[PDB]
Amino acid sequence: EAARKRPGMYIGSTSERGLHHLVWEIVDNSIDEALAGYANQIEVVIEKDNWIKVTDNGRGIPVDIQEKMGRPAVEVILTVGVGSSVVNALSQDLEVYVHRNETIYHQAYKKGVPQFDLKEVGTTDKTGTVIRFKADGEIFTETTVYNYETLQQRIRELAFLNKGIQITLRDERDEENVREDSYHYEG
Ligand SMILES: CO[C@@H]1[C@@H](OC(N)=O)[C@@H](O)[C@H](Oc2ccc3c(O)c(NC(=O)c4ccc(O)c(CC=C(C)C)c4)c(=O)oc3c2C)OC1(C)C
């Protein structure tokens, strides 16, 4: 309720500017993984009902119990790095899927509140993190619709700034017209 009561301090504004900042924070975490030498592919998806899906082929947010807290690391990071917690707090629903240790780990949240303990929901050969979120309509009272062009412009800049990372943007809001933009700069 720290981020919810005063959302201005944590993200900036609750307008369209603050709405797209939700996406930048989540993507910045995937770019960090790529800069460390552990990811090379990031995918930003605008899904039905303006849900956002950000996927990377990183190491997967660790799932091991943190000795002090007594909870998995993914839970800790997302419910306070600071940025992911704020996005979680400002979202009416947030889902995380971690692909690590040949297992698929899942946790869902509501307004930053864990709905259930981290559960194992599958098996994998791949590593990476999938973060799905729906912005809180009660917080973002102006608009809850992402402007594709605003997303495309910053994604193009980030792929250019961070050479060698493939960043893809896909709009799937209307199944009748699916637009996609793939960026990858060697230079
Ligand atoms: C929001 O989570 C972000 C990550 O987001 C994404 N997209 O992967 C990413 O930006 C970055 O990811 C890191 C940052 C550091 C390590 C890292 O130092 C690792 N080394 C380990 O073997 C390890 C194993 C277990 C463990 O709990 C920790 C420390 C825990 C951390 C950093 C959450 C480290 C590792 O496996 O994964 C790491 C990962 C995936 O830091 C987070 C967790 C805040």
Rounded to the nearest angstrom, the distance between the alpha carbon of 128 and the centre of ligand 1 is 11
- Block residue for tokens 């792929």: 159
Residue 61 CA to ligand 1 center (angstroms) comes to 5
**Using what technique was this structure determined?**
X-ray
Q: 121 in helix, strand or coil? A: strand
Q: Decide: 115 and 127 in contact? Cβ < 8 Å.
A: no
Would you say 57 and 37 are in contact if contact means Cβ atoms under 8 Å apart?
Answer: no
Minimal CA–CA distance to 26: which of 76, 81, 106, 104? 81
3-state secondary structure of 158: helix
- Rounded distance, CA 108 to CA 95, Å? 4
> Residue 82: enclosing H or E segment and its boundaries?
helix 82-89
Structural element, H or E, at residue 55: strand 52-56
Measured distance CA(18)–CA(130) in Å, rounded:
22
Measure the N-to-C terminal CA separation of the chain; round to a whole number of Å.
Answer: 44
Find the helix or strand (DSSP H, E) in which 20 lies. Answer: helix 16-35
Residue 81 near ligand 1, beta carbon < 6 Å? yes
Can you list the domains of the chain with their CATH numbers?
A: 1-187 (3.30.565.10)
Report the candidate in 162, 20, 2, 19 with the shortest Cα–Cα distance to residue 82: 2
Q: Is the CB of 16 under 6 A from ligand 1?
A: no
- Nearest atom, ligand 1, residue 66 CA: 27
Give the residue carrying structure tokens 């995380």: 96
* Backbone Cα Rg of the chain: 16
Distance from the alpha carbon of residue 22 to the mean position of ligand 1, in angstroms: 20
The resolution in Å comes to 2.6
Q: Which residues contact 17 (CB under 8 A, 6 or more apart)?
A: none
Could you tell me which residues are beta bridge partners of residue 105?
98, 120
Quick one: 71 exposed, middle or buried, by C-beta within 10 A (0-12, 13-18, 19+)? middle
User: Contact 61/74 with Cβ under 8 angstroms?
Assistant: yes
The amino acid present at 175, given as its one-letter code, is E
Choice from 23, 33, 38, 86 to test ligand 1 binding pocket (greatest atom count within 8 A of CB): 33
Closest Cα to residue 171, out of 151, 143, 185, 155?
151
Asked if 105 and 118 count as a contact pair (C-beta separation under 8 A), the reply is: yes
Ligand 1 lined by 57 (C-beta under 6 Å): no
Return the H-helix or E-strand segment holding 8. helix 7-10
DSSP tag of 168: E
Rounded Cα distance, 116 and 109, in Å: 8
**Phi then psi for 154, rounded to 5 degrees?**
-75, -35
